[PDB]
Design an enzyme around this catalytic site. Structure first.
Site, PDB file in Angstrom:
ATOM      1  NE  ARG A   1      -7.521  -9.616   4.880  1.00  0.00           N
ATOM      2  CZ  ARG A   1      -8.485  -8.836   4.363  1.00  0.00           C
ATOM      3  NH1 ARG A   1      -8.374  -7.517   4.207  1.00  0.00           N
ATOM      4  NH2 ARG A   1      -9.595  -9.427   3.952  1.00  0.00           N
TER       5      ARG A   1
ATOM      6  CG  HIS B   1      -9.974  -1.756   1.453  1.00  0.00           C
ATOM      7  ND1 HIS B   1     -10.291  -2.265   2.692  1.00  0.00           N
ATOM      8  CD2 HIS B   1      -8.671  -2.073   1.245  1.00  0.00           C
ATOM      9  CE1 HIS B   1      -9.244  -2.893   3.194  1.00  0.00           C
ATOM     10  NE2 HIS B   1      -8.243  -2.779   2.340  1.00  0.00           N
TER      11      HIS B   1
ATOM     12  CE1 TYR C   1      -4.351  -1.372   0.698  1.00  0.00           C
ATOM     13  CE2 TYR C   1      -3.004  -2.962   1.881  1.00  0.00           C
ATOM     14  CZ  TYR C   1      -4.214  -2.585   1.317  1.00  0.00           C
ATOM     15  OH  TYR C   1      -5.293  -3.436   1.354  1.00  0.00           O
TER      16      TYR C   1
ATOM     17  CE1 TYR D   1      -2.682  -6.315   3.902  1.00  0.00           C
ATOM     18  CE2 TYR D   1      -3.475  -6.167   1.621  1.00  0.00           C
ATOM     19  CZ  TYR D   1      -3.651  -5.935   2.969  1.00  0.00           C
ATOM     20  OH  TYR D   1      -4.796  -5.305   3.350  1.00  0.00           O
TER      21      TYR D   1
ATOM     22  CG  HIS E   1      -8.340  -6.897   0.155  1.00  0.00           C
ATOM     23  ND1 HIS E   1      -7.180  -7.512   0.561  1.00  0.00           N
ATOM     24  CD2 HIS E   1      -8.361  -5.698   0.779  1.00  0.00           C
ATOM     25  CE1 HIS E   1      -6.542  -6.741   1.411  1.00  0.00           C
ATOM     26  NE2 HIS E   1      -7.238  -5.631   1.563  1.00  0.00           N
TER      27      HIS E   1
HETATM   28 FE   LIG Z   1      -6.411  -4.026   2.786  1.00  0.00          FE
END
Ligand SMILES: [Fe+3]
Ligand SMILES: Oc1ccc(F)cc1O
Ligand SMILES: Oc1ccc(F)cc1O
Ligand SMILES: Oc1ccc(F)cc1O
Ligand SMILES: Oc1ccc(F)cc1O
Ligand SMILES: Oc1ccc(F)cc1O
Ligand SMILES: Oc1ccc(F)cc1O
Ligand SMILES: Oc1ccc(F)cc1O
Ligand SMILES: Oc1ccc(F)cc1O
Ligand SMILES: Oc1ccc(F)cc1O
Ligand SMILES: Oc1ccc(F)cc1O
Ligand SMILES: Oc1ccc(F)cc1O
Ligand SMILES: Oc1ccc(F)cc1O
Ligand SMILES: Oc1ccc(F)cc1O
Ligand SMILES: Oc1ccc(F)cc1O
Ligand SMILES: Oc1ccc(F)cc1O
Ligand SMILES: Oc1ccc(F)cc1O
Ligand SMILES: Oc1ccc(F)cc1O
Ligand SMILES: [Cl-]
Ligand SMILES: [Fe+3]
Ligand SMILES: [Fe+3]
Ligand SMILES: [Fe+3]
Lengths: 200, 236, 237, 200, 237, 200, 200
Positions: free
Chosen positions: C157, C162, C108, C147, C160
């Site tokens: 995770r 959000h 991110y 990640y 995905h």
């Molecule tokens: Fe996330």
């Protein structure tokens, strides 16, 4: 995905754990060789210390049937896995809380520094596994020392605990017990001041 | 000179019993309410004691002879044997296996046991041994009886033997309980049912093993133990 | 100004995830221990912002172009598109859909992400758009990577994106996550499994949509969103 | 019974919610127009006020990554739904806790009174929705004002909270920040002083 | 020098893909129209190169590091590991495993790839290694992206890694492709479907292998390879 | 019947096979050591020869992306399996068609005679495996030599091809390339003059 | 994945296709308005041309029951979709092979250049769809002109045909038919000189 054989599941050690792992405390005779709470004979190198503590449940009451296993480096920061009652020092020991007072004791030396897998020094620590009636799978924690503040602040394991308030739960308090250097390390299983427990 | 030279497969904490299992009443006040803190493995976690040179007595594994006060214990003579392996199916040699149990009537030789079934003067209830080079262990004992306990108002533990296994590191150390094939108390026990997955409970049920019995002498039960998988580090 | 002209079907809080889901460790201390207090809908709850007059940039919906520092992002080029409807099946037009995601390697672009997978100098990870008059939205992006995260000792995770959706009132506003068809990480994730009903989890899985792909260019995934049903008031007072 | 289409289920906003909804706070560039925490232009009608607060978890620790959405009437008790950065007043805004201090701020006007569906006046209030890592579905609450005690005592929404002690959790405390009128509204997600959260 | 000391179980050419599979368009003109001529195994067929004395670089098996131009590749960090065995289940030790793949966005580092998804300056896409004494191999890489190709008008290869395995003889040498668990493109691909038996396709699908993952670092996939069974000669001449 | 584990199924090498197995040809950097098309050091025993050829599809068009693996005895009829770039001779090599001209080349020695499993001499031959985009499982063939007519007529492998006309497809034509002894071996995958391909 | 409604599957037009789509050729009366083979009235702008051709099967035999539909830009490179027999030019027409000679004819103008979707000019072309008994789904091709060599060489559609030899199959041959400019365009369905057919 790939699935391996499942691990045999844990169960509580139960109230009579001492008959199997702490023979004296059950009120029974002991065998010729037993695994117990004196990790260091007087001649072992390092600073000889007494460790002691009590174990509390979620209502603030003593857990009088706790059993602890400990694993620590020697004074030079090396783990000694060849367990032998002849050794001046063993890295492994066992202790238990007495049924009247609830206190466990350990006689050992202060462990030296050992590096984590990335080569970063960890603060001096004793690895603890806690078993008891009502504990379905044993709880892992570490005992660090309040006179190692500089090292504790830089410990890569302590720094994985998000809140500083929670890090304080793993710091044993230096004192003196009938003339000898000692550290007190209470464990609170649940609630206010709950001790940090690890998964790894 | 213990060395960090391996990693242990992460535990499945939905396969193991959770800490808070309220039907097992004592777990309510003795379970954390904060999450466990995950940490990477280091030499502290990936090493542990080896008990190869602990001094074992001749009868340490034989509960029919290790508390001899004038004769044999009363009860169902059995051998309890099995193999300790890891999750990859590799044997775990020279590892410490400890066990403890009640006598044939469900009475423990411990000062805190107030059940009024009598002690057996020739039975103590403790054993230990080291697995052999192929991962095998064996005990001889008597089959323990069920016993009542102050959980609910009519709760009874199934017949069981407590087991402790060291394995190669403190990360692999396990305490568990062995139950016996067919015992109708097993599905009723809140300690058994601390394990949510019935397939995990099945792993704790020792199977009658007629092939290992001594005719005209003793029966046998098989109890294999699986410790966390051990692998070499890679790409670290 | 806004008027109270409608009611919104009550949420099923056993379909949604509950607050306390302890395998998702951070939920333990961030979940209430008192019951929610139910209140009737008033104008305060049955109204909310409309974003028709918000100024959108040309590339706000196109994550391939909206963080352009000399080139294209590296990763699986995809369109993510779908329709926002309510529980009665009625389209939700002119509604704000926002999205945010990691790059192709699961990193991110946020100062608190300590995962050491590299940033992509041409990828930002944020998009927004307003549904059209028929309820449809569309983004272009790269497929995010899974990640790792500090929950259990080896938790990851699934890939995905959000999503946040405003809808017609503050009662309809929703934040959720889109997952991708077939990802073997989905059944293993304690955040996914905060949803107790596996049929509800299926509603968060975007389906490969070949009909919406641009040949020799990009694939496409379809993710339809269902907000609380809206009805007229009747027989009140 | 009649079953409609199921609502898409909620998921946590997660720790990196800011990259989508609070870009500046993520450490990132912002777009030409962003939805943020200044609801009122300087010349908007009504009493200009600052709102601020901190968010606490069940251990009494700051939730440094929380994100709040607010919805309030203007000074004349009208909800302004046509969101526009050029509006004198927007009824909608967004704010987030700072990572250092854990404090959110909102610049707005004191809302006018609006009636409930039965025509009964509600006390002046801000509708709040709270999102964060660890919060699987957002929490709804209301901020009322401690200098509106007469109105608060008669509010048909506050009166649905059975215990007066719990009603107190929704009352923001008047104070001054850099000499300007302000109200502080701390949220306690769990435990002692737990803030009332609504379902509707 | 090499000796004729073994025989290799005959291939099942209905388990393998046939040569003429017209949905894979390029196969039409590149497939024989005469039958293969069967011949007995001789020393020519039952021997082959051993690569134990080939000089491998330190990073030959690590695609994260073996094309290092100032940084890490962008994409899903993965270990791809497994065991090479023969049809009798015996490990194939000290055997050459080679692999090649596109980057995270489905772009190959090859002058003939006209897909316009960008190259990754820190990713090359080639690895090799020699199985250990127990038959195991391991690579570290990024998960490749799908990519479009000029077969039908909207055809996309699933994410895949090409593999070549030498084995003990020229009779065992194999080239194949690894696909990834759950990828919805797999059942749609005419190259996958060159294999007529869906159970054979399942053998090419690598499984997510959490036990081999490095937490906070990389995921892992398992891909075991089965070469023709090798047996001693018996009762010959 | 007895069923063993199934073999992993073949797939096409694909158009970009060169990035894994012919790095130079992909347009890419090479590694310190590569398996390629010079089987013999200049001082290797035997008659040094160049082999070359083109590969044609069923429409008579060049297959410009084909990849060949070769396996042959040395001049003394011995298979040298311990692959090493320092060897005077390797029995194994790899080559690929150039994209412009579609021609592959191999530098080697003429192989010596080896016996089949029944002790019958085979004519001198190179074993070839052909890979390419469009070829789902590699094609096996053999290259024999037109100046070995007496040996070829008696070869127990050539004699398993029923039609003499088809045997002719496996006979390479002696020629000269830059004045040096060479043999040309064109492969026709399909149609008129289709090359014999083997199963074993 | 997402699956739409399936398309209605194609079937052969069959041997009596002309009764429905080419009424005169069946030997039947025609209606007042029919869709047929004269796209341009004499007054339409552009170069007036005759197109003609024959259709061959895989054995080299005439397909005498073929039906062709054509779609082309006008002389200015614009498609005219408003079909009307009153128009000076229609972009759409139909023709069929006569049962004795096998030849189809079309009267039209040479189409102007039209750009593809990326803005790249395509060479002048007529889009053809071929139907017949034995053809299960119609075959799409294009007719280009041999006097547009410079444009043909740069056509982004022609350049998607991998082999230049195959591109030659789409080039009609200029000639003169009783004094008028004409182009011949034979189609070979199968085998030697097989016409390129497209999917889109
Ligand atoms: Fe996330
Ligand atoms: O970093 C720390 C370590 C130990 C402690 F008690 C407090 C800390 O803040
Ligand atoms: O705090 C907790 C509450 C419920 C539970 F199941 C686990 C917890 O750690
Ligand atoms: O860096 C780490 C932090 C926590 C953990 F459980 C594993 C890690 O590798
Ligand atoms: O480095 C690691 C690798 C595997 C694992 F399970 C834990 C680790 O800390
Ligand atoms: O106080 C609570 C305890 C457990 C739970 F699941 C929900 C609660 O609100
Ligand atoms: O009067 C009411 C009170 C609480 C509620 F949730 C709904 C109502 O209609
Ligand atoms: O009056 C109402 C009607 C429907 C509803 F869902 C909520 C309300 O307050
Ligand atoms: O430890 C690491 C984890 C992820 C990454 F991209 C690089 C690292 O060095
Ligand atoms: O609650 C769940 C949701 C999805 C799933 F795959 C498993 C679960 O237990
Ligand atoms: O009715 C009330 C309203 C607000 C408050 F803080 C206390 C109350 O008793
Ligand atoms: O000549 C052939 C024709 C069809 C086929 F499937 C295989 C052949 O070898
Ligand atoms: O003699 C043979 C001939 C052809 C073949 F495939 C196998 C044989 O054993
Ligand atoms: O003699 C042989 C035995 C087995 C086999 F697969 C091939 C042979 O040529
Ligand atoms: O047309 C395109 C296709 C793929 C890509 F990465 C860029 C393009 O412009
Ligand atoms: O041959 C096939 C193989 C895999 C598949 F999914 C479908 C097929 O028709
Ligand atoms: O026996 C033969 C061998 C090779 C050849 F070209 C023709 C033959 O008849
Ligand atoms: O590019 C071409 C176009 C038309 C043709 F006939 C031949 C070509 O090489
Ligand atoms: Cl006694
Ligand atoms: Fe017990
Ligand atoms: Fe490929
Ligand atoms: Fe018909």
């Amino acid at each position: 995905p790939i699935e391996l054989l499942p691990e045999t599941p844990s169960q509580t050690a139960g109230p009579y754990v001492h008959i199997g792992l702490a023979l004296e405390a059950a009120g029974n005779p002991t065998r010729d060789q037993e695994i117990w709470n004196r990790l260091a004979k007087p001649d072992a190198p390092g600073e000889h210390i007494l460790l002691l503590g009590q174990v509390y449940d979620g209502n603030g009451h003593l857990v009088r049937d706790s059993f602890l296993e400990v694993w620590q480096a020697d004074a030079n920061g090396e783990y000694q896995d060849a367990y032998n009652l002849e050794n001046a020092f063993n890295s492994f020991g066992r202790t238990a809380t007495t049924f009247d007072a609830g206190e466990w004791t350990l006689h050992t030396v202060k462990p030296g520094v050992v590096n984590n897998a990335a080569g970063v020094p960890m603060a001096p620590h004793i690895n603890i596994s806690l078993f008891a009636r009502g504990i379905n799978i044993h709880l892992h924690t570490r005992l660090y020392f309040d006179d190692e503040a500089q090292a504790n602040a830089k410990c890569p394991v302590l720094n994985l605990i998000e809140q500083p308030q929670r890090r304080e739960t793993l710091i044993a308090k230096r004192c003196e017990v009938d003339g000898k250097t000692a550290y007190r390390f209470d464990i609170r299983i649940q609630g206010e001041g709950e001790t940090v427990f690890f998964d790894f | 000179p213990a060395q960090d030279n391996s990693r242990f497969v992460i535990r499945d904490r939905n396969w193991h019993p959770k800490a808070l299992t309220p039907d097992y009443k004592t777990s309510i006040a003795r379970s954390p309410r904060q999450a466990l803190v995950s940490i990477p493995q280091s030499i502290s976690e990936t090493t542990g004691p080896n008990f190869s040179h602990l001094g074992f007595g001749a009868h340490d594994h034989d509960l029919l002879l290790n508390f001899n006060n004038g004769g044999l214990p009363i009860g169902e003579r059995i051998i309890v044997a099995g193999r300790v392996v890891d999750q990859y199916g590799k044997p775990v040699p020279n590892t410490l296996v400890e066990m403890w149990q009640a006598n044939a009537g469900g009475r423990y030789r411990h000062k805190n046991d107030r059940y009024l079934a009598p002690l057996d003067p020739n039975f103590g209830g403790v054993g230990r041994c080291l697995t052999d080079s192929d991962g095998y262990y064996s005990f001889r004992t008597i089959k323990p009886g069920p016993y009542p306990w102050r959980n609910g108002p009519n709760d009874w533990r199934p017949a069981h033997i407590h087991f402790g296994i060291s394995g190669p590191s403190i990360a692999t150390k396990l305490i568990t309980q062995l139950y016996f094939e067919g015992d109708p108390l097993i599905p009723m026990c809140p300690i058994v049912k601390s394990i949510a997955n019935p397939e995990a409970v099945q792993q704790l049920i020792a199977k009658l093993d007629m092939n290992n019995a001594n005719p005209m002498d003793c029966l046998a039960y098989r109890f294999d133990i699986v410790l966390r998988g051990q692998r070499k580090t890679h790409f670290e």
